[PDB]
Structure formats: structure tokens, C-alpha cells
Design a protein around this nucleic acid. Structure first.
Ligand SMILES: Nc1ncnc2c1ncn2[C@@H]1O[C@H](COP(=O)(O)OP(=O)(O)OP(=O)(O)O)[C@@H](O)[C@H]1O
Ligand SMILES: [K+]
Ligand SMILES: [K+]
Ligand SMILES: [Mg+2]
Ligand SMILES: [Mg+2]
Ligand SMILES: [Mg+2]
Ligand SMILES: [Mg+2]
Ligand SMILES: [Mg+2]
Ligand SMILES: [Mg+2]
Ligand SMILES: [Mg+2]
Ligand SMILES: [Mg+2]
Ligand SMILES: [Mg+2]
Lengths: 48, 74, 117, 176, 134, 55, 301
RNA sequence: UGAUGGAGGUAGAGCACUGUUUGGACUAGGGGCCCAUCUCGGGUUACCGAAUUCAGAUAAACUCCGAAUGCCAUUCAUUUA
RNA sequence: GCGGUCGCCUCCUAAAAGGUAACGGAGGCGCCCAAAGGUUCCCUCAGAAUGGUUGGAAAUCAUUCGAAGAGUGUAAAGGCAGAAGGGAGCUUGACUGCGAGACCUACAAGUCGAGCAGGGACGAAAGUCGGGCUUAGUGAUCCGGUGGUUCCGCAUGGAAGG
RNA sequence: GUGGUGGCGAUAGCGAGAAGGAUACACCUGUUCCCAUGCCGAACACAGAAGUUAAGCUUCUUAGCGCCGAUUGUAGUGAAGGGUUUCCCUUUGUGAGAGUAGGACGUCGCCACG
RNA sequence: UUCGGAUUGCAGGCUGCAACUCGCCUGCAUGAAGCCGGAAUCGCUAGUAAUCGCGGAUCAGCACGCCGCGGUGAAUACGUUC
RNA sequence: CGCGGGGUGGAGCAGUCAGGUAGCUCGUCGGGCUCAUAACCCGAAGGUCGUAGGUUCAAAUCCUGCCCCCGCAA
């Protein structure tokens, strides 16, 4: 239910982040604005 | 049953009054701020006090019944 | 029925600001006080516990009946006195009020007149 | 605003001549009037609570604040944070209009209104009334009064005392 | 006597050096029973002495028990080797230091008081004596 | 007073035709009212037996 | 699918039988373990005597006494470990089963022995009248199977009954006075949102609703989903559960049997044949209507 | 070793919190008895008694307090190594 | 031998630094939170008395009393009402590379960390933000799997495979 | 003298009582605008200056509450010993807590105005 | 339901020394159960059944009963397996 | 004090694993059939599953305790 999760830069398709979430409370595919060091900017990181 | 306990963690003071010390040192480990931070002193996630710059450690009463740590350099 | 005293509530919020702003000789406080009528503005080194400049609508030099414009005027004048005293940088102690009205106008005036918060 | 003009002109001299105040700012002054409606049955279905919100709105012209529990009580299947009824706080001209509406319309319209209690005070100069039965003026909209629940109607003052509050409400119109 | 509730079943036996903090002078009654030695005193001892005093007084006067058995005490069954934990609580006890007053009496003449306390003293383990209030 | 949440609260008249009393106050222009402070008062079996059988 | 039925029955038989074996044997071994253990403890009691009687002690070779007691406990433990291995074998079982359940139905009849009548009803659009005129009736405890081809006008008839027919009508159709309908339609797309909101829009008991859903076979991990997300069979189960939870006197079922499982077919048949309420039914599974109804009525142009 | 400055809540003491606990004043409340019974309102065993209060106690897992020692440190002193 | 225990956290024991054993006393953990985080702004609790309708012993309303007697996701301890407690906005710093220096430490590990750089959040700004109130929520290597890679590629180019 | 703003362990506080508003601070009149109230211009914010300082706020009295706090004496205890050794005693040194005597209804500054 | 009329409140009428226990009738108002009745069971073959009212005996007053009276007026009986 | 197995209408039992809203048989009560009783037929009553709480939309069921019964020990 509570699962460990690799996020991913939608552009680079690079994972770049590890995190946690419920599936009940956070069923929709999580997203954030996180730093991609390969681009050295901030970018929409989407769960995968 | 009752036979178990955890690793004792080595809290309390680690630097003494009137003692010169390096920056980034540790002065007082603690769980909960049994002593507050003061001059040139920070506080960590685990409420541990650390001197940001060099100087002599000085402990002081923060008024009536709460304590303080301070680091006055030279 | 009783009512809270606005000044005492102001002082509570004020101390809560004091615990993370304090004036020094290199970056003093600009300490606001605000009445129903007038507005006072001190400039303070908390290290020595001594002021460096003052301003008020109660100083014969202002223009404007609107309290916000009096606030702007005292901002101009306290900025003038500070630059005369020999400092440009300062911390803005909002006194326990909101940075919205008279206080905002005063601080914006002083920023324009040269100071660097 | 007739009630406020009365409070300024007729009440205050007639009050100070008795109570012997060395300043008009010792005058008892109505600071607010609070309405409350506890429901409880809303825990069964809060549609009745929506209805109570509706009636407070129709009564006052003022949306109410829904109150909520700070506790859970197994005796009533009650959970903290759930909506126990509603309240309103009138202040000013709206408050005076509401009180004047009470005295001049809806205290008579109770079936057997020969008066009200005199002892219903807190010992500190603030009055507490209670409507046991709804439907006390025409715009209660009798066509959709599903249930009579009642109201608590607190009347807060700057009055130091029972006596000040009682005399004030006497001159204002409350038929003790 | 028993405490109706306790936070911790098992306790330490403790120590008994030194005189008593309080209960050191007679307060409610006219006469009292002072301990000259420190010792543990139990439910059964207290109740036996109380009954002795009451019967010799013929339900006259009034008695006051100042001590109380707050503490417990364990034991192992005969045949049990040491270890494998701590024993089960047998009864309840009061550690009574020297200088302590245990029983006070009033509402009864002096000779009757002395004799009743004499009886209770013979029932108790402690070396005791008589005390009188001013 | 916020917008879009409060009912329309308009000055209206309350009228007691029993006494003709005319009052103004805000509610949700002239309205019908039966009784009020200016028209309300507060602001048997022996007899019946005797009526039925004169005594 | 017949072969699949046979082989899955065989699998289930094997699973259940092996589970029963394991349960029986584990209980046996636990009993024997406890008894061997008590025997060992009684032997350990021989290390010691009795204080009440003189001479019982002074015991010699307590080491051998304890050794033998230990061997008996080691028997007990070997037997317990066997039981644990058998439990491990058990845990691999009962995974591919369904655990079928019955259903319920909030049928609420009244004095109306005539619940619906139809008289000379010829029905259609633009006077292209869609089926020859019919007269029939639905009484209490009577089921009526209205049938015909596709586009024969069955849902159109239902629309004429419930007054939302946008076509041309000639003939009579009369409900009772204050009759309550429950309703399972052919076009349930309109349902949307969570179930705690669906059951508010449709005045239902949330508990009875989810109960009838789980009895139909929806796992309770699904109640957190949305009707937009559910499979078509699950949406269909939502519709059927609405119907079964609605206290009603006539039931109108427009193809409940489409997007469901064989288990659900069986549940519905068993329930309707057990209760025998007053119902209008529309199906193309002729076998189902044979199992239930004799009053069958074939509308046609 | 001395001087100085610190951390620290132990023995002791105390009840200012948390628990245990004695006696007394008062008492919500709980018991019967009777009158009144729609079982409705009382009046008493100096009936059992929350809670408050007075006085007295108690504690390893209570502290309003709090040592002696011991500990850390002093480009401090003395003596040794 | 059975029972119980084996890893981790909290208290007492533990003898006012730290540490300290027992088959000594008591309890917990093998997670949760997308806001229960961050920032800005604002607020202060529990209970008692009084009064009031259903509504009672006790829901909700109002005043006073009210120094914490509450709450702090979850055990106990410590601490917190200058809030770490509570509420509402804007967000995602629950960032990347690091890291002087200290604490603990047999080793392996564990803990704290100012400060620098990049690129940001909030805020007017100061300035805070490298998860939560602090301390448990975890386990080596080998071996496999997934993604990326400017690395290698058995004479060369690839490929296999690392 | 009032107001603002800081430091010192409330010896500063809490309660009660008296007086005052010259300026001042305040209440106070409103919602016109910036802005705001899970409802309300009560609070926030804005504008004003009819009125009263009644309250708050200042100054004074009060030792009722709370705070501080000796000296003496004791318990405890380091070191050195003794005894009849789960404890008790002696020499020396230190030395509480409690209970008091007593203090204490503030001290130190900076700035603006009168 | 304008069904059904119970029950209940109020006013009256008669009888009779007296209508509370404990009468009959009327008016007003309320307007319950009950939508043809399980297992089972009863009467009846012709002016019968079914239904409709009328009178009388007792009776100061009071019967949905009893006795009698007449009005309207069916269906069925294959047949003795049971 | 501990370890196992039990507490479901009056009796005996499932349902407990796998939460889905209390049932099987007998018995009791009432009415029918019968000359009467039994059998038979038609009806009903009797339990929130030992109990106080949690988890859940929902608990006999899962969790935590508390109180009784049968074995051992004791
Ligand atoms: N609005 C319309 N206009 C014209 N014809 C229509 C309309 N709605 C339906 N029809 C036609 O009516 C006929 C039957 O329609 P209906 O919806 O009643 O079918 P049905 O009985 O449910 O059929 P099926 O077995 O396919 O479900 C079909 O020929 C259809 O095309
Ligand atoms: K003795
Ligand atoms: K007659
Ligand atoms: Mg942390
Ligand atoms: Mg169709
Ligand atoms: Mg002690
Ligand atoms: Mg230590
Ligand atoms: Mg190659
Ligand atoms: Mg090659
Ligand atoms: Mg002292
Ligand atoms: Mg015949
Ligand atoms: Mg029978």
C-alpha cells in the first residue's frame, strides 16, 4: 500500500529521486518540481 | 517478559566551560532542548548543540530556570 | 465582557518577531510604533541598547493629513537622518503589525529614499 | 436603528440617573448577540444541519458558522471534528434590528408568551435566552419547517451585573 | 490492609538506615507507640495489634494507624532454583524506620492506653516504647 | 459583509393592522403582521355547572 | 470452457481434501506434543521430593532424570516441527477459489395484486409503429419475460411506462397509485463518482449497498475506486446492487445478465426463484427465462 | 593538590505535579424504611460515599528543591615525571 | 531440557559526567504523513462555575475562572505556550555535488554539522528551508534484475559480456 | 511628566484600593476606499476627531497571594578509623532541604515631545 | 377513499328514587384496525341458499340474541372411487 | 499463577480460517386434526454470538483486555 517510488524527469527520462507514497491517499501518479542535475534546472518529475 | 534495553547513547556535555574549541564541534548532545542555543551556537535535528566558530565555551542561565550555551571568540 | 488590548497583542507578536530579528551597529533595527492617530519610528542598536535616529508625525515637519502619507513622510525623514548618521543597511522590525498599510507605505518610502533592508 | 437611537437618547439618561455613573462610558452596551442551534441528529444525517443553516440565513441575512466537536462521545456515536450545529454573531445595526424584531414581533407570537425569566443571567451581566419552539415570525416559511429544534440566543453586554443588564433590557423592550 | 491499586506490581526491598522523616511525634491521639528500631511491618501484624488494642479498650476511644503497607514483597516456591525471573508477590509491607509513631490512641484513660500499647508491642517485631502528647 | 454568500437583506416594514403600528427594519417592502408588543396583553367548572343548571 | 470447468473442479476438490488432511494431522500432532510435554514435566518433578513427608529427597542422578525428561521433550519438539511443516504446506492452498455467497432482496409488497396493466399498446416513432399491439399484466409474485429481437422496442416500452418516451404512443399502460419501482437499465453510463456519493444521490444505505456488492463478488479493495475506473462488469454490479438495495414492489430488469459472471447468473437465478417477487424481465439468455418464468411474451413488428 | 568556572538531579529533604494513603468537616451521588405512588418530593441509620478542604504520611521507574564526592576544562599556580 | 530470549528504541537498576551486568523491573518498534513537510501570517489549551431548549452527568453557545494540570501521528523519557501545539494562504528544500570539524567507536557502521557552489520555494525584507519534536521503523557481502553512462571491449570494427 | 524601546534570575509579578489625561496613549464614530472577517468592519485594515478617560494605561498605598532569602542547628556525606557489621558510632572537613529573621509593590539605560 | 365505522372528547334526550362502577338513543368532532383472510372447517337441493327489512315474548328503560313474519331470489346434484 | 480447548435463543451445533449484518435440528408457546393424547399441519416467541473497548462503511468473526467452564499442572 505504502510503496517506495522512483520519480523520473519527464524530459531526460532519468530517475533522479527516491520517495514514498500511499496508493489510497495518493492514487494519481505523483508529480513534483525537482532538480535534474543532468539538466541543472528544475523540472516536472513524474512517478514511474 | 522484561529482559531488554537499548544502546545507551552518550548524551550530556562534551565541551567544558572555559574551553577553547574548533568550529563545528559538539558541546552538548541531548534529547529535547534541556539547554538552549545561544551566541555562535546552532542546533541540530536531534537537538544537539554545536559551535559555529571558534572560541571559549560559556554556559549561562537564560534568566531564571533555563540554560544557555555561548561561544565568545578571541 | 472584556476585550483584548491591541497593544498587548502587538507586544506578543512583537516578541515573536524579536526572537529572530535584532539590531546591531552594522545592521540596526528600524522599530515601528503605531497609534490610532500618529506613528513613531526609531532606529536602534540592540547591542548597546541605544538608538541612532528617530522620526514621527509629531515633529512639525510633515505634510499630509492622511495617516499613510504621514507614514511615508516619516519614512523619508528617518531615512534622511539615518544617511546623515552614517548607515544604509538596517533590519525592519514591524513592531508586531502587518506590512500592509501605514507600515508598508513607510518602509517603501525609506527603501526608495535609500536604505537597504 | 430606532433601537440604537433609543439607546442613545432615552435609555442612557434614564440609566445614568439611577445607576449614578460619573462618566457615560460606564454605560451598559450590547456588544453582540449570538445565535446557536445544536442538532446532534446531524450525526445521523446532517441534511437537517443544512436546514438549520438555511433557517439561520433566512432569519438573519447572515451565513452561520458550523460548530464542530473537540471530542468524541461514544454515547451519541459522536466523533471529534463532526458538525454539531451552527451559530451566528450579530454586531451593530444588524444586531439592534434583530433584537427589535424579537421584541416587536416574535416574542408575542409564541403561543403562551406571558413573559420570560428574570434569573437567566450568568452573574456577570450577560443574558441567555432560549427558543424551545421555532416558527415565531412569518418569514420562518412555515411551508418547509420540517422540525422545530429551538435556539440558544445569547445577548452579551458591557454590563457589570445582573441589575445593569436587567434594567438595560427593560428600557430596551424585553418584557421580563 | 492492602492498597487497592498499584502502578508497579514489583518493587525494591529498599534500605532502612536513618531515622524517619515524619510520623515522628504524636499528633492526633494522646498516646502513641514509638519505634526504637527500624524494621518491616506487615498487614497481619498491623491487624493483630489493632484488634488487640480495640478489644482491651472495649471499643472505647479511638485508634489511628499512621503507617500503611505500600510496598510488596515476593518469594519463590520451595523447590525453585534461583533465576528465571522474579518471584510472585506474597503480601504487603510497610518499612517503618526508628523514631516513627505507628499507633496513636485517645479517648481512653492512661493506664488502659499503656496496656493496650504494651499488647500491640508484644504483637509487633519492633522494640517499641510509649510516647505522650503535650 | 462578504459577497455571494449572504442572503439579500433589505429594509422592509412590519405592520400591525390590529393597531396600525408601523416599524422599519431589515429582512429578506410592507409585510403582514398579526400581533406585536403594541397589541399583546402582557405588554371554569363551578361557573359552568352553574350556567348549565342555574343556582 | 467445459474442460476448464471440469479441471478447475478437480483442482478445488484436491485443494480442499489436502487442506482437511493437513488440519486433521496438525491437530493430532499438537495434542501428542502437549501430552509428551506434560510427561516430561512429571518426570522433572521426580528430581524433587515433598516437604510435607520426610525422606522424599536426597535424590541422586538428577542429571539422568533431567536427561530422560529432555529426550521426551525432544520428541514433543520433533512432533511440533512436523506440524509446522504441515502448516507450511497448508499455506500454499485455497488461493484459486471464489467462496461463493448468496444474495438478498428488499422486496416490499402491498395489497396491489395488479401492479401493471397494458392494453392494446402499439408503440413506435413517427408512426412507424414498432410492434403489433399487445395487452398483458404484471401481478404480485409474478415474473414476466418480455422478449424479441434487437431494436424490437423493449427499452422503448420501459420508457413509455416511466413516461420518458420521445416517440409516438397509442394504447394504454397503467401502473398502480403510489407504486415504487426498482430499475436496472440497459444504459447505465450515467453513473459517476465515488460510491459514498452515488449512494447519496440515490437514497440508499451505504452498508447494505457495499454488502450486496461484495456478495455479488466485488472485492473491498474496489470501493475506494471511482465508477469511471471500474470495469463494465463492476459498474453493472453497482447498478444491480442499487436495485437490490432499493425497497420496492416491482422490479424492472433490462438485461442484468450481460456483463456478469456465471457465478452471478447462478446467484440471480437462485435468489429470484427463492423469493419469487413481482418482476418485469428482459433477456436473451433464454435458458434463464426458462428456469424462472412461464409467462413469456414476444413482441414483434 | 590548590584556586576558578561549568555540566549533571544522586543521598537527603519535600508534596509544588504523577501515583499510594490515614483521620476529621461538608457533600454530589448510591442504598433501603415510610408517607405519598403517575413512583412521585422527602427524612432519617451519626448507612456507603465522588469531589473540595484542614491536618498527617509515602515512593526505584514522583521532584518545588538539592549536597558531599566524583567528572570536564583553564597560552592559571605548586610539586613530580 | 521446556518456557523465555537473540535485532532496534525509551525509562529504572545505573551509585547527580559518560559507561556499567543479571533468566532484574516496566513498555514499545519492524511504521506512518503528499500534509501530520517547508515558508509567511494569525491564534492558544484542559477542565470547573454560571445560564441556556430538545439535551442527558456530559455534545453545541456565551462570560469568568483559568500556567498548562492540554496537545505534541505512533511507546516511555526529555522538551516545547517567545511555541516543536492549533488554523489559513503559497508551494515541494522529503533538492543536486559536497563538507571543515566534532561526538560515539575494536572494526564495520552510526550521529551532528556551520559553510561553499548550482538551481529554487516562501516571504516586502531580514532570513528559514538538505523532511516530521528528539531519540526505534531495520540488515553486510555474494548473487541476480531495471534505467542511464563521455568507461572497457582478447589482431581490427562491432557484438557478446563486464 | 507622558509615550516608545531595550538589559538585569518577578526582590520587577498577581490581587485590592486612590487619583489623572496638559501633550500623549487609549478607548471612541464609521466602512468611503488598500485589506479582512470557514458568520460578523468584534479581531485585521483604512479614515476621522463629536465625546469619555469609565476601562485599559500611568503614578501612589497595600506584605493578602506569589518571588527572593540569610544566620544558627540538623540530616546527608568525602577522608581517617572503631564496633556488638542487612546497621550504628567517633575525629576532621563540607553542608543541604524544611522552618524562619528579613527583603521586596523595581532597577539600569537610550530616544521623541512637553 | 365521501370506504369502514371502532375508540375517544363535548353537548343533549328518554326511562326510572337513581344511568360512576353499569343503560339505550341522538348531534357535533376525531376517524383506529380492516383492501376478502393460514392450517383447517360450517350450512344448504327451492321459494331453498343468499340478502332485505317488519313485528312480538321478556321489558319502568335496554339485545348484533330468540321466536315468528313476509319482500327479492340463484347455482348445482355427472355419480358413490373415496 | 501459567499452558491448551471452550462461552452462539431452553439443549446440542455450524458459521470464526476467508468481516457482508444469525442460522440447522430438537424443544417451548398458540391454533388446527383427533372422542382424547402422541405423531402430523399452520403460526409465533426466544440470542446484537460471555463481557468493556478499538479497527472498519459494516464485527459473532480481526485486535486488545476483563469475567466464567473442562483438562493438566497447581
Ligand atoms: N430516437 C429514436 N428515433 C428513431 N428510432 C429510434 C429511436 N430510439 C430508438 N429507435 C429505434 O427503435 C428500435 C428499438 O429501440 P429500443 O431502444 O426500444 O430497442 P431494444 O428493444 O432495447 O433493443 P435491443 O435488444 O437491441 O436492446 C430500433 O430500431 C431503434 O433504432
Ligand atoms: K516486640
Ligand atoms: K322492548
Ligand atoms: Mg530530524
Ligand atoms: Mg434493449
Ligand atoms: Mg530517597
Ligand atoms: Mg551517570
Ligand atoms: Mg575485438
Ligand atoms: Mg578475437
Ligand atoms: Mg536554606
Ligand atoms: Mg334434503
Ligand atoms: Mg402444540
Amino acid at each position: 500500500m505504502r510503496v517506495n517510488i522512483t520519480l523520473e524527469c519527464t524530459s531526460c527520462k532519468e530517475r533522479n529521486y527516491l520517495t514514498n507514497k500511499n496508493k489510497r491517499n495518493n492514487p494519481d501518479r505523483l508529480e513534483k518540481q525537482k532538480y535534474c542535475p543532468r539538466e541543472r534546472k528544475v523540472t516536472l518529475h513524474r512517478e514511474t | 517478559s522484561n529482559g531488554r534495553d537499548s544502546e545507551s547513547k552518550r548524551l550530556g556535555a562534551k565541551s567544558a566551560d572555559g574551553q577553547t574549541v574548533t568550529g563545528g564541534s559538539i558541546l552538548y548532545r541531548q534529547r529535547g532542548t534541556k539547554i538552549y542555543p545561544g551566541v555562535n551556537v546552532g542546533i541540530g535535528g536531534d537537538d544537539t548543540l554545536f559551535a559555529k566558530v571558534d572560541g571559549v565555551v560559556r554556559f549561562e542561565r537564560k534568566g531564571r530556570d533555563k540554560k544557555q550555551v555561548s561561544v565568545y571568540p578571541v | 465582557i472584556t476585550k483584548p488590548d491591541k497593544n498587548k497583542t502587538r507586544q506578543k507578536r512583537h516578541r515573536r518577531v524579536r526572537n529572530k530579528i535584532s539590531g546591531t551597529a552594522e545592521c540596526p533595527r528600524l522599530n515601528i510604533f503605531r497609534s490610532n492617530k500618529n506613528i513613531y519610528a526609531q532606529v536602534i542598536d540592540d547591542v548597546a541598547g541605544v538608538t541612532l535616529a528617530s522620526a514621527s508625525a509629531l515633529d512639525k515637519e510633515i505634510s499630509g493629513g492622511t495617516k499613510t502619507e504621514t507614514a511615508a513622510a516619516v519614512g523619508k525623514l528617518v531615512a534622511e537622518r539615518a544617511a546623515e548618521k552614517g548607515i544604509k543597511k538596517v533590519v525592519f522590525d514591524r513592531g508586531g503589525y502587518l506590512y500592509h498599510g501605514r507600515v508598508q507605505a513607510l518602509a517603501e518610502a525609506a527603501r526608495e529614499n535609500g536604505l537597504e533592508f | 436603528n430606532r433601537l440604537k437611537e433609543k439607546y442613545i437618547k432615552e435609555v442612557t439618561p434614564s440609566l445614568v440617573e439611577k445607576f449614578n455613573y460619573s462618566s457615560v462610558m460606564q454605560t451598559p452596551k450590547v456588544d453582540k448577540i449570538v445565535i446557536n442551534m445544536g442538532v446532534g441528529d446531524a450525526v445521523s444525517n446532517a441534511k437537517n444541519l443544512d436546514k438549520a443553516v438555511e433557517e439561520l440565513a433566512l432569519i438573519t441575512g447572515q451565513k452561520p458558522l458550523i460548530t464542530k466537536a473537540k471530542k468524541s462521545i461514544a454515547g451519541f456515536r459522536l466523533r471529534e471534528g463532526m458538525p454539531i450545529g451552527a451559530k451566528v454573531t450579530l454586531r451593530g445595526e444588524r444586531m439592534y434590528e434583530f433584537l427589535d424584531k424579537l421584541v416587536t414581533v416574535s416574542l408575542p407570537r409564541v403561543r403562551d408568551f406571558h413573559g420570560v425569566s428574570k434569573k437567566a443571567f450568568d452573574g456577570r451581566g450577560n443574558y441567555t435566552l432560549g427558543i424551545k419552539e421555532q416558527l415565531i415570525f412569518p418569514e420562518v416559511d412555515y411551508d418547509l419547517v420540517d422540525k422545530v429544534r429551538g435556539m440558544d440566543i445569547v445577548i452579551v453586554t458591557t454590563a457589570n451585573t445582573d441589575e445593569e443588564s436587567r434594567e438595560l433590557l427593560a428600557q430596551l423592550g424585553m418584557p421580563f | 490492609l492492602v492498597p487497592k491499586r498499584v502502578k508497579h506490581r514489583r518493587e525494591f526491598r529498599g534500605k532502612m538506615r536513618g531515622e524517619a522523616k515524619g510520623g515522628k511525634e504524636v499528633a492526633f491521639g494522646e498516646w502513641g507507640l514509638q519505634a526504637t528500631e527500624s524494621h518491616w511491618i506487615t498487614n497481619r501484624q498491623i491487624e493483630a495489634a489493632r484488634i488487640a488494642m480495640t478489644r482491651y479498650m472495649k471499643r472505647g476511644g479511638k485508634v489511628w494507624i499512621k503507617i500503611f503497607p505500600h510496598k510488596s514483597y515476593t518469594s519463590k516456591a520451595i523447590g525453585v532454583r534461583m533465576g528465571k525471573g522474579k518471584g510472585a508477590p506474597e503480601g504487603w509491607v510497610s518499612p517503618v524506620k526508628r523514631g516513627k509513631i505507628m499507633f496513636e490512641i485517645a479517648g481512653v484513660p492512661e493506664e488502659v492506653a499503656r496496656e493496650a500499647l504494651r499488647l500491640a508491642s508484644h504483637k509487633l517485631p519492633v522494640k517499641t516504647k510509649i510516647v505522650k502528647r503535650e | 459583509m462578504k459577497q455571494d454568500i449572504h442572503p439579500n437583506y433589505q429594509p422592509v416594514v412590519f405592520m400591525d393592522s390590529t393597531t396600525g403600528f408601523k416599524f422599519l427594519s431589515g429582512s429578506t417592502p410592507l409585510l403582514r403582521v398579526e400581533v406585536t408588543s403594541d397589541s399583546h396583553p402582557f405588554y371554569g367548572r363551578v361557573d359552568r355547572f352553574n350556567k348549565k343548571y342555574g343556582l | 470452457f467445459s474442460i476448464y470447468e471440469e479441471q478447475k473442479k478437480l483442482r478445488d476438490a484436491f485443494e480442499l481434501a489436502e487442506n482437511e488432511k493437513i488440519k486433521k494431522e496438525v491437530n493430532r500432532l499438537k495434542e501428542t506434543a502437549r501430552k509428551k510435554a506434560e510427561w516430561s514435566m512429571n518426570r522433572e518433578g521426580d528430581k524433587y521430593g515433598n516437604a510435607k513427608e520426610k525422606g522424599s529427597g536426597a535424590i541422586f542422578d538428577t542429571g539422568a532424570i533431567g536427561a530422560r525428561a529432555a529426550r521426551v521433550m525432544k520428541r514433543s519438539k520433533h512432533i511440533q516441527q512436523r506440524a509446522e511443516t504441515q502448516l507450511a504446506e497448508k499455506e500454499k492452498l485455497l488461493k484459486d477459489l471464489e467462496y461463493i455467497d448468496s444474495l438478498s432482496m428488499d422486496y416490499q409488497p402491498t395489497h396491489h395484486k395488479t401492479l401493471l396493466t397494458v392494453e392494446e399498446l402499439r408503440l413506435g416513432y413517427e408512426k412507424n409503429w414498432l410492434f403489433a399491439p399487445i395487452s398483458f399484466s404484471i401481478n404480485a409474485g409474478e415474473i414476466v419475460g418480455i422478449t424479441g429481437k434487437n431494436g424490437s422496442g423493449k427499452s422503448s416500452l420501459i420508457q413509455y411506462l416511466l413516461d420518458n418516451f420521445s416517440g409516438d404512443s397509442e394504447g394504454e399502460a397503467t401502473l398502480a397509485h403510489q407504486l415504487t419501482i426498482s430499475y436496472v437499465r440497459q444504459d447505465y453510463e450515467d453513473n459517476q463518482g465515488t460510491l459514498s456519493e452515488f449512494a447519496e444521490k440515490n437514497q440508499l444505505d451505504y452498508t447494505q449497498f457495499l454488502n450486496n456488492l461484495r456478495k455479488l463478488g466485488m472485492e473491498r479493495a474496489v470501493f475506494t475506486n471511482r465508477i469511471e475506473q471500474m470495469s463494465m462488469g463492476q459498474r453493472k454490479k453497482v447498478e444491480v446492487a442499487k436495485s437490490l438495495s432499493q425497497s420496492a414492489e416491482l422490479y424492472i430488469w433490462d438485461q442484468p445478465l450481460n456483463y456478469l459472471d456465471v457465478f452471478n447468473h447462478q446467484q440471480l437465478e437462485a435468489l429470484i426463484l427463492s423469493v419469487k417477487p413481482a418482476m418485469l424481465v428482459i433477456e436473451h439468455d433464454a435458458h434463464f427465462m426458462k428456469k424462472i418464468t412461464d409467462k413469456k411474451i414476444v413482441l414483434k413488428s
